[PDB]
Structures are given as structure tokens and as C-alpha cells.
DNA sequence: TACGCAAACGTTTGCGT
DNA sequence: TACGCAAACGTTTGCGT
């Protein structure tokens, strides 16, 4: 079809191309003629013809886990902004933590020759680490590890541990000593790492967490619902709960409410993520904020770099969580004794 | 690179191609040889070379509005599933209701030669209708109109009006006569249409909605927060509120709570959307359910059809909302008198 | 000066044999 | 029998003039 434009304007295709991309000087008249032809013919240059020739698609691949979840959804929306801004195209892919699904999306991606790869798989068993290596040739950044588990990718790190410790500390400082915890999947950074940060703050404080006070969640509201229940559904119960993700938290608030428990009056709750509408939880949620956008933009950035500046050496940038006081926590019995 | 495989296996490229796509019979040995070469060379066939030749990218474009919002997020996640299943690729694009952004994504898309287009723009001013027409050549379905506003696309319709009427009715039947409403943007189907369905149910019931009881929202929790406030922040106040979107609802619950109002005891609330975690609102939200996935799959389907079966004539499938009783509503003063 | 030539990018697929 | 030939898809870009 570029050929069709050329001839309407009676110039070579080279000419047409150049005008379209301002890639060399073209007489005004010539330039107009082309634009004109371009207009009538209603011409849309093919990006595929072009990618074929130039060797880059100017499109990037996001190999995610899931995309509905607030946490995720929030990141992803940031990532798209960045692509758009730098004229990249976003191919969103959810592998649902399924290897097969993951090998699949992976290959489609390479086939579609994405300039780079954004990775958000949540859990990294060896097999997955393995596959990934198989594509080291395609530049990519992992956005969800706590440390850098490989030398063949960039990593943006969140300090999940330090956020976890921040949480316990707060409780402690608010007069609390009988606490529970509903962590997310241990096979995840945001799961294992937050918990550990949190557990450290406890040991330092000589506070012990009775195993009946720790209940595993899966980051979904139902999981929070069940745990909260299980925790409060017991003889002796904590006065405060550390909940590993705001959504699970929302589920824990529901249950308390359902058992007719008062928050924070009867139980204090601290979440983690500071999702866009945690302030609208009832009550407004006190939580740990994760810099979602910085998280996004930052990764998009390392990628671009490796892409354009052809970096070769793995890099890794840290990001920092931070406390956000809202109204789900109340002073504990030991407040005054400090 | 296909050339490199050919020669390692000492067969023509045609051969290589055929084996790769099982497109004609190939001797076993030959077939193996190729696979072998394919393996060592670590070959990834280029989809772009292929798309160039075959004339279709096997990738689809979602021109959305925003993607964080629960409602949206939910749809989109469904759409991806479908693409994946039928081996399509999803290019997610958010135009944020901005024309420029929209003309932009639109063109990038055509350039990338997407097989079809999924449209979710929320608001359709003429200019936008205009642009869209300019691409009638690319098959597309609009997933967010109440009726079919053009003859050059497929439309999947939700019966937003009938859901709105369902809502009012319920209130009415629960003993309510003093009701308020926080609608979403009138420039939208889910805004205008829900409200109107709702207003019809009222007129039929000879219930009048004092303009001070109707407050515009924008589908965001803050908007619900403000409206609820404004409504209850008044001398005389309704006993029940119809809130146009679950998220805005969540914001309305917060405020009530903040003014120390009891739900549903002091005020009853009915939402709309039945978002994945409306059951975890506190209290569990009574709302109107929108068939999000059917919504997604269904559109993906008309698209595919038009794509493959080369349909040419516009089509339109309706979908149906439905009531979901949870615990945010309570009997009204007129219950017994019916 | 301001532009055109033709090879090249990586596959597919209608004829042949 | 089981496979190879060469044109074609739609751009880009190094030489020339
Ligand atoms: O894996 C996760 N899923 C959902 N929300 C989350 N917030 C932190 N980690 C996660
Ligand atoms: O436009 C909308 N935005 C967000 N949520 C919604 N739910 C229905 N319509 C909408």
C-alpha cells in the first residue's frame, strides 16, 4: 500500500517513507503531495512491515499472574501509562501461576518479538526460573522478588521485610502484646517477606506468637474472612492483628463485624498495601503503603534502558514501603507502661 | 533464521515451514531432523514475518477507559481469558476518556494491524463516534452502550435500565418511600440508564425524588463519600439510597459510618455491579449483579465471528442484570401496609 | 539539490517434479 | 512419493546521481 501512495504522488516509495518518518529532507511540494495521497488513500502504514525491516516491535510484554486484584490492577495501570508515554504497546498476559500457561504466554511473546519483558509471576519455582533463563536473550525485569534470584534480569526490590517490621513495631508502640497474623502465601515475597519482617519486630520485643494466632491467607477477601474468624473464634484472642494484604484485610473486617466485634475497639487491625480504596474501608484502614506506581515506572525504566542503551549487566533498584495511619488501630493495654 | 534451520537439517525452508505448521505431509526422518535443528538452534519462529505473509496478527486490541476500577478490571480479566483460549494476544489500551489519547491508541492499533477491536470508552461524543467510523474496516465490538448507536459495529447490551428499575422496585417492596440516589456520569450508559430505570420504578409508585436527594457520583469511592454525606448532612433525609456503582457505594458506607449512621439500621443502601468483593463490604452489600464475564466472553465471541466467518452485518446481543440480596437493606416504614 | 534503485527483513504457499 | 522453487507480503535505507 505504500506503493499505492507513491504512485498517486508520483514519487518513489523511498520518498514516501522518508516524508512519513522525516528521515531526510523533502521538498515542500513533494511532502504535501505525499500527505495528500496519504490522505485520500486513507493510508495506515503497517507496523508489522516496519518491525520486520527495523527489527523491533516497540511493544512490551507483561507476563503477570492475575489482573483483577487491586494490588495487581494498580501496578499494571501504571505500567500502561509509561508504555503509552514512550510510545510502547502493552501486551498483557496472565499466567495464573500456571507453568503451562506460563510456558505458553512466554513463547507467544518471544514469537511476537516483544522488545522487552515485564515479569510478575508471584511464585518462582525452579522450573519457572529455568524457562525464564531460556529467554535471557529477550531483555526483561522481574518486579516481584525480594532479592535478585538470578543474574540474567533486572529486579526492582520492595523491602517487604522492612515494611513487615514497620507494622509490628507500630503495634508494639501502640500498647499491643497479644497479636495475630494472617500472612499471604509463603511462596511469595509479599507473603514470606512481610511476615518475617514482622516476626523480627516481635522477637526483638520478646513477644511470642502462639501458632494458633497465625493463619495463612491467599490475598483474597475470603481468606481474610476465614482467618479472622478462626482467630477470634477462640478462647483466648489477640488484641491486634497484622493482616498481610489490604484485601484480605477487608475480609477480616467483615467477619469481625459479623461476630459483632468492634474495630478497632474490640480488635485493632493493620493491613498492608495501601490499595486505592483502603481509606474507604470501614473503618479507614491503617496500613503499610507500597509504592505501586514508582514500582511500575521504575521497572519500565530499567527495561527501557537495557533496551535502548543496550545494557547487559543486571541491575536492581530498591523501593520503600511506608506507614499510613488511618483508623483501624487503637492503643493497647501496655501503652501507658512505656 | 528459518533458513538456518533448513540448512542444518538440509532441507528446504518450505519443508521447515510445513513441519512447523503440519501443513502438508513430511517424512518422519525429515520431520525429526527439522525438530532437531530447531532445537539446537533454539529457534523461535517470527510471528511478525508470519503475520506479514498471512495477513493477520492473531492479536486483538482493547481500547478501554481505565483498568484499575473493579468493574473494569473484572471485565478485562475475562476478556484476556478468552483471547488466551483461542490463542489471541491482548493489547490493552486505556484512553482515559481523552480524545487525543483515544485517536492516538486507535492509530497505533490499526498500525499494529490488530485482527479486531474491543471497545470500552464509557462516553461517546460525536467526535469519538466519528473517529471510530474511520476504522469500520477493522472489525470491532462496543461493549458499553445501552442501545446500538451505529451501524458499523457489534454491540453487546446490558439492560442497565431494567437493572435500575429492579433496584427501585426492591426498595419499594421493602417498605421504602423516602429514597435518594447517587447516580454515575449521565454521559454513560451505566450512569444515565440505571438512573432512568430507577426513576421509572418511582413514578410508577408515585414517589417523588426531591432534587436534594439526588447527587451525582463519578463511580469513585470519594464521590460516594461526598454524596452520602451531602444527603445525610440534611434536615430531612431519605431512609434508603440507591447507589449507582458498588465502589461509590463503598464510599457511601464509609461516610454513614463516619457520621455514626447505622447501615442498614439508620439507612438502607442498594448498590449496583456486584463487584467481586461487594460481599465483603461491611455490611455485605445488597446489589444488582452485572454479568461481567458473560459480558466479556460474549463480546469476544461476536468479534471472533465477524473475524472468522467474515460477518459484515452489525449484530447485538443483550445481557441481563439480576438482584442479589445481601445485608445492606432493611424493611421500610411502609412494609406492613401493602 | 532533492530524490530513486534494489536488496533485505523472515515467512508462506501455489506449481512443479 | 515426499519435497523444492521463487515470488510475495509491506517497509526501510545504503549508494548513487
Ligand atoms: O500476590 C499478591 N496478590 C494480591 N495482592 C497482593 N498484594 C501483595 N502481594 C499480592
Ligand atoms: O464507568 C464505570 N466506571 C467504573 N465502574 C463502573 N461500573 C459501571 N459503570 C462503571
List chain A domain ranges.
1-57, 58-159+290-321, 160-289+322-338
A302 alpha carbon, distance to own chain's centre: 15
* CATH homologous superfamily of A1-57: lambda repressor-like DNA-binding domains (1.10.260.40)
Q: Could you give the maximum distance between any two Cα atoms of chain A, in Å?
A: 89
Please provide the DSSP assignment of B184-244 as one string: --TTSIIIIIHHHHHHHHHHHTT----GGGB----SSHHHHHHHHHHHHSSSS--SEEEES
Q: Is the CB of A7 under 7 A from strand D?
A: no
Q: Quickly tell me which residue has 480479566 as its cell.
A: B77
Q: Which of B318, B302, B281 is nearest to B70 (CA)?
A: B281
Give bridge partners of residue B160 from the DSSP assignment: none
Nearest alpha carbon to residue B217 among B249, B241, B193, B239: B249
Strands B116-119 and B59-64: parallel
- Is residue B16 within 8 Å of residue B6, measured between CB atoms? yes
Q: Three cell numbers at A71?
A: 494490588
Question: Does the C-beta of B49 come within 7 A of strand C?
Answer: yes
Cα angle value B75/B119/B153 (rounded, 5°): 125
Chain B residues closer than 8 Å to A40 by CB: none
d(CA A141, CA A60): 11
* Ligand 1 contacts CB of residue A122 (under 6 A): yes
Specify burial of residue B101 (Cβ count, 10 A radius: 0-12, 13-18, 19+): middle
- Cβ of B69 less than 6 Å from ligand 2: yes
Alpha-carbon distance of A274 to A272, in angstroms, equals: 6
Burial of B282 (0-12, 13-18, 19+ CB in 10 A): buried
Please enumerate, by residue number, every residue of B annotated as part of a binding site for hypoxanthine: 71, 188, 190, 219, 273
Q: How far apart are CA B173 and CA B194, in angstroms?
A: 18
In eight-state DSSP terms, residue B86 is: T
User: Which CATH number does A58-159+290-321 carry?
Assistant: 3.40.50.2300
- Fold: same for B1-57 and B160-289+322-338: no
Adjacent-strand bridge partners of B141: B118, B154
Sheet holding A287-289, edge to edge: A179-182, A240-243, A268-273, A287-289, A322-324
Cell numbers for B84: 488466551
* Cell 497465625, residue located: A214
**Of residues B218, B176, B219, B220, the one with CA closest to residue B198:** B176
Distance CA A310, CA A182 (A): 43
Place of cell 434508603: B240
Which experimental technique did the depositors report for determining this structure?
X-ray
Q: How far apart are CA B316 and CA B336, in angstroms?
A: 43
DSSP-derived secondary structure letter, B259: T
How many CB pairs (< 8 A) connect A and B? Answer: 144
Q: With 0-12 CB in 10 A as exposed, 13-18 as middle and 19+ as buried, what is B51?
A: buried
Instruction: Please name the residue that has the C-alpha cell 430531612.
Output: B236
Residue-wise DSSP of A209-258: --GGGB----SSHHHHHHHHHHHHSSSS--SEEEESSHHHHHHHHHHHHH
d(CA B209, CA B197): 14
For domain B160-289+322-338, is the CATH number 3.40.50.2300? yes
Query: CA A30, CA A283: separation in Å to the nearest integer?
Result: 67
| CA B231 – CA B129 distance, rounded (Å) | 36
Tell which one of B96, B161, B185, B188 to mutate to probe ligand 2, the residue whose CB is within 8 A of the most ligand atoms. Answer: B188
Closest protein residue to C10 (Cα–C1'): B49
Substitution target in A51, A60, A68 with the highest count of B β-carbons within 10 Å is A68
Residues of A 28-87 whose CB lies less than 7 Å from any atom of strand D: 43-46, 49-50, 52-54
Cell numbers that stand for B124 in this block: 461517546
Q: How far apart are CA B250 and CA B271, in angstroms?
A: 9
- Site to substitute for ligand 2 among B273, B285, B288, most atoms within 8 A of C-beta: B273
Cβ atoms of B120 and B63 within 8 Å: the answer is yes
How far apart are the CA of A116 and the centre of ligand 1, in A?
23
* Three-state secondary-structure class, residue A188: coil
Q: How far is CA B131 from the centre of its chain?
A: 21
CA A39 to the chain's CA centroid: 42
**Resolution of the coordinates in A?**
2.7
- Contact (Cβ atoms closer than 8 angstroms) between residue B231 and residue B294: no
Whole-number CA gyration radius for chain B: 26
Asked if residue A47 lies in contact with residue B113, where contact means CB atoms within 8 angstroms, the answer is yes
Query: Chain D: nucleotides under 7 Å from a protein CB?
Result: 2-6, 8-14
> Which has the closest alpha carbon to B139: B323, B335, B312?
B312
Q: Pick the closest to residue A192 from A132, A154, A149, A233 (CA basis).
A: A149
| Nearest protein residue to the C1' atom of C3, measured from CA | A15
d(CA A56, nearest CA chain B) in Å: 10
Q: Is the CB of B98 under 7 A from strand D?
A: no
Contact between B135 and B107 under an 8 Å Cβ cutoff? The reply is no
Helix (H/G/I), strand (E/B), else coil: B264: coil
The pair phi, psi for residue A255, each rounded to 5°, is: -50, -45
**Strand pairing partners for B62?**
B92, B118
Which helix (H) or strand (E) segment holds residue A300: the answer is: helix A292-308
Q: How far is residue A324's CA from residue B165's CA, in Å, rounded to a whole number? A: 41
The four Cα atoms B202, B208, B210, B215 give a dihedral, to 10 degrees, of 10
- Rounded to an integer, what distance in angstroms lies between the CA atom of residue A181 and that of residue B27? 62
Contacts of B282 in chain A (CB under 8 A): 253-254, 257, 281-282
Q: Name which of B80, B111, B225 is nearest A92 (Cβ-Cβ).
A: B80
C-alpha cell at B22: 503440519
* Separation CA A31–CA B310 (nearest Å): 37
Which string of DSSP letters, residue by residue, matches B149-180? --SSSEEEE--HHHHHHHHHHHHHHTT--SEE
Q: Which of B297, B333, B268 is nearest to B88 (CA)?
A: B297
| Residue B181 β-bridge partners | B214, B242
Helix axes A70-85, A292-308, angle to 10 degrees: 40
Contacts of B333 (CB under 8 A, 6+ apart): B175, B176, B177, B239
CA-nearest of A119, A118, A155 to A315 is A155
CA B312, CA B303: separation in Å to the nearest integer?
A: 11
Which three cell numbers, joined as nine digits, stand for B307?
473475524
- State in Å: Cα B123 to ligand 2 middle: 11
Handedness of CA A202, A204, A205, A208 (dihedral sign): positive
Neighbouring CB atoms inside 10 A of A266's CB total 14
For residue B62, how far is the Cα from the chain centroid?
10
Q: How far apart are CA B248 and CA A260, in angstroms?
A: 25
Q: Are B147 and B306 within 8 A, CB to CB? A: no
Spatial distance from the CA of B38 to the C1' of D1 (Å): 25
The vertex-B76 CA angle with B52 and A142, nearest 5°, equals 75
Amino acid at each position: 500500500t505504500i506503493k499505492d501512495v507513491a504512485k498517486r504522488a508520483n514519487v518513489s516509495t523511498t520518498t514516501v517513507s522518508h516524508v512519513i518518518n522525516k528521515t531526510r529532507f523533502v521538498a515542500e511540494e513533494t511532502r504535501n503531495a505525499v500527505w495528500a495521497a496519504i490522505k485520500e488513500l486513507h493510508y495506515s502504514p503497517s507496523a508489522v512491515a516496519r518491525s520486520l525491516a527495523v527489527n523491533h516491535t516497540k511493544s512490551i510484554g507483561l507476563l503477570a499472574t492475575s489482573s483483577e486484584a487491586a494490588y495487581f490492577a494498580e501496578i499494571i495501570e501504571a505500567v500502561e501509562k509509561n508504555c503509552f508515554q514512550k510510545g510502547y504497546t502493552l501486551i498483557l498476559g496472565n499466567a495464573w501461576n500456571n507453568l503451562e500457561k506460563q510456558r505458553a504466554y512466554l513463547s507467544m511473546m518471544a514469537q511476537k518479538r516483544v522488545d522487552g519483558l515485564l515479569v510478575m509471576c508471584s511464585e518462582y519455582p525452579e522450573p519457572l526460573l529455568a524457562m525464564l533463563e531460556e529467554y535471557r536473550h529477550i531483555p526483561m525485569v522481574v518486579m516481584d522478588w525480594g532479592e535478585a534470584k538470578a543474574d540474567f534480569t533486572d529486579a526492582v526490590i520492595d523491602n517487604a521485610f522492612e515494611g513487615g517490621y514497620m507494622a509490628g513495631r507500630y503495634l508494639i508502640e501502640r500498647g499491643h502484646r497479644e497479636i495475630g497474623v494472617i500472612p499471604g502465601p509463603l511462596e511469595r515475597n509479599t507473603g514470606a517477606g512481610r511476615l518475617a519482617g514482622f516476626m523480627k519486630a516481635m522477637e526483638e520485643a520478646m513477644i511470642k506468637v502462639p501458632e494458633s494466632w497465625i493463619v495463612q491467607g491467599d490475598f483474597e477477601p475470603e481468606s481474610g474472612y476465614r482467618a479472622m474468624q478462626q482467630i477470634l473464634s477462640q478462647p483466648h484472642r489477640p488484641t491486634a492483628v497484622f493482616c498481610g494484604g489490604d484485601i484480605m484485610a477487608m475480609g477480616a473486617l467483615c467477619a469481625a463485624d459479623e461476630m459483632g466485634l468492634r474495630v478497632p475497639q474490640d480488635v485493632s487491625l493493620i493491613g498492608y498495601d495501601n490499595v486505592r480504596n483502603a481509606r474507604y474501608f470501614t473503618p479507614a484502614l491503617t496500613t503499610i503503603h507500597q509504592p505501586k506506581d514508582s514500582l511500575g515506572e521504575t521497572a519500565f525504566n530499567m527495561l527501557l534502558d537495557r533496551i535502548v542503551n543496550k545494557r547487559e549487566e543486571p541491575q536492581s533498584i530498591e523501593v520503600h514501603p511506608r506507614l499510613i495511619e488511618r483508623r483501624s488501630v487503637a492503643d493497647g493495654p501496655f501503652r501507658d507502661y512505656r
